[PDB]
């Protein structure tokens, strides 16, 4: 790393400690900046589908294009029914631009969810059915709008429990929104997004959603599920936990910004405490979103470590 002193004229965070940084450094090759006291100010602000994740999914219909999915193995006991009614008693209240509207609960026993599906594919389709070729700035945008959705879920302490690329939906490039949120009552499909810490067996940590989001960024940057040729989940699943295996950061496309590779790398941190929280991720993605217009198509001769320690 090489460094320059920099004033940050915009909301930005100190990568060592994730606190706000007004004044300090930038790694001129990496953006990372050392944590080098003052109080903070106020910043500037400006038909069947399948068993599903853990509920069998149907293209149901009622007024408002509401699809349906049904309980799997968890029995509709009154304790769990009450917990579901309480979780619904959050989700049916929250509405957010990057979240699909939770519309209500099916009144019959063997509970089922009524929630809107917006036309345009699951993100799973654009990745693995096609790998639809589109501008990299829209890859950042997808990451932004998904992240900004997850930011509200975390801003509401909704933990996704089992976030997957399949449960993310694109309005034909108009926007992306999050499904499969909350509803932890039914949990305990397929699994590459489980954090290593969880597969070492509160696994639905506030920060476990971070790791799953990390896997989504890999798929965006690489066009594929992780572990391209070690595909036996049941073989890799334990050992991605036990410390052997993590997704190959080299498979990213050569024209991605170094910082996005870096963001993914910090996102995939195994030790939970400092997997970055989503406000910082959002700020990082917000920096990339305008950095990509700024950065030149090819590198040049920097100022040679001019103001490092």
């Amino acid at each position: 790393h090489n460094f320059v002193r920099k004033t940050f004229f915009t909301l930005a965070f100190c990568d060592f400690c994730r606190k706000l940084l007004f004044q300090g450094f930038r790694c001129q090759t990496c953006g990372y900046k050392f944590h080098q006291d003052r109080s903070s100010s106020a910043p500037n602000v400006h038909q069947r589908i399948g068993s599903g994740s853990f509920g069998t999914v149907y293209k149901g219909k009622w007024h408002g294009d509401v699809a349906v999915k049904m309980l799997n193995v968890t029995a509709p006991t009154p304790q769990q029914l009450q917990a579901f009614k309480n979780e619904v008693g959050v989700l049916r209240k929250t509405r957010h631009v990057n979240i699909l509207l939770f519309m209500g609960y099916s009144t019959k026993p063997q509970l089922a969810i009524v929630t809107q599906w917006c036309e345009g594919s699951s993100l799973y389709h654009h990745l693995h059915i096609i790998e639809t070729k589109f501008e990299m700035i829209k890859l950042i945008d997808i990451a932004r709008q998904t992240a900004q959705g997850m930011d509200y879920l975390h801003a509401k302490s909704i933990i996704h429990r089992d976030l997957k690329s399949n449960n993310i939906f694109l309005h034909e490039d108009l926007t992306v929104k999050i499904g499969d949120f909350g509803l932890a009552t039914v949990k305990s499909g397929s699994i590459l997004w489980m954090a290593p810490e969880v597969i070492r067996m509160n696994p639905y940590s506030f920060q476990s959603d971070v790791y799953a989001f990390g896997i989504v960024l890999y798929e965006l940057m690489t066009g594929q599920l992780p572990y391209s040729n070690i595909n036996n989940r049941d073989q890799i699943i334990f050992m991605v936990g036990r410390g052997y295996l993590s997704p190959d950061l080299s498979k990213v496309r050569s024209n991605c910004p170094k910082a996005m590779k870096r963001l993914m790398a910090e996102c995939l941190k195994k030790k939970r405490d400092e997997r970055p929280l989503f406000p910082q991720i959002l700020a990082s993605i917000e920096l990339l979103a305008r950095s990509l217009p700024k950065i030149h198509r090819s590198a040049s001769e920097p100022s040679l470590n001019r103001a490092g320690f």
Binding site: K19, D37, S39, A42, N44, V45, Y152
Partner: protein, 218 residues
């Protein structure tokens, strides 16, 4: 022109030529007409970070003064150079929002926002000032903040954050600062609920900065 001047300002931010954004943007306020709820944020973001460049540089050169030897004289005159440019731009935004904006927002709660700015800019002069000016300036700053009252709203928390840090950094009275910040933080976190339509994207940060500032002062 008004559509234009705001247009140049909107570009100038993307160009990061904030100095030119301020020179343009206050040309809107010198129309004497009321600012839109957008124009207010563009004015405040221009002048804050335009001064921001001077504040951080003033901190650095003052730091290497303190760490310093005949070069001390060069450093001291340069500190006065950056201080006058800071002082002079800060007087500008003060004179502007005193001369125009505060008297022309009646019962729009921009009436709070412009008092908060008046507080902040005197607060920045109170960093520059020495013993003589400091009290004369600080009195004027506190009148602004203490008047700047009308509940999760970013501004009300923004005032409380900013105003509590005024008490900590400049009055050096942690009892007030802790008292304010903790009080205002509870009145946020006990309440929330507005967040999505409030654009929690803002108010959570200020709410967090209260928590961790308290953690610094505690």
């Amino acid at each position: 022109d008004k559509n234009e001047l705001v247009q140049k300002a909107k570009l100038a931010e993307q160009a990061e030529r904030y100095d030119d954004m301020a020179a343009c943007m206050k040309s809107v306020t010198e129309q004497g007409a009321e600012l839109s709820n957008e124009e207010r944020n563009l004015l405040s973001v221009a002048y804050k970070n335009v001064v921001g460049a001077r504040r951080s540089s003033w901190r650095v050169v003052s730091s290497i003064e303190q760490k310093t030897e005949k070069k001390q004289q060069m450093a001291r005159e340069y500190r006065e150079k950056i201080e006058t440019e800071l002082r002079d731009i800060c007087n500008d935004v003060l004179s502007l929002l005193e001369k125009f904006l505060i008297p022309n927002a009646s019962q729009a709660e921009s009436k709070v926002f412009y008092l908060k700015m008046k507080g902040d800019y005197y607060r920045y002069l109170a960093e520059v000032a020495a013993g003589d000016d400091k009290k004369g300036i600080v009195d004027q700053s506190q009148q602004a903040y203490q008047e700047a009252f009308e509940p999760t709203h970013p501004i009300r928390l923004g005032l409380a954050l900013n105003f509590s840090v005024f008490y900590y950094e400049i009055l050096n009275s942690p009892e007030k600062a802790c008292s304010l910040a903790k009080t205002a933080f509870d009145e946020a976190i006990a309440e929330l609920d507005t967040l999505s339509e409030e654009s929690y994207k803002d108010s959570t940060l200020i709410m967090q900065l209260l928590r961790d500032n308290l953690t610094l002062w505690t």
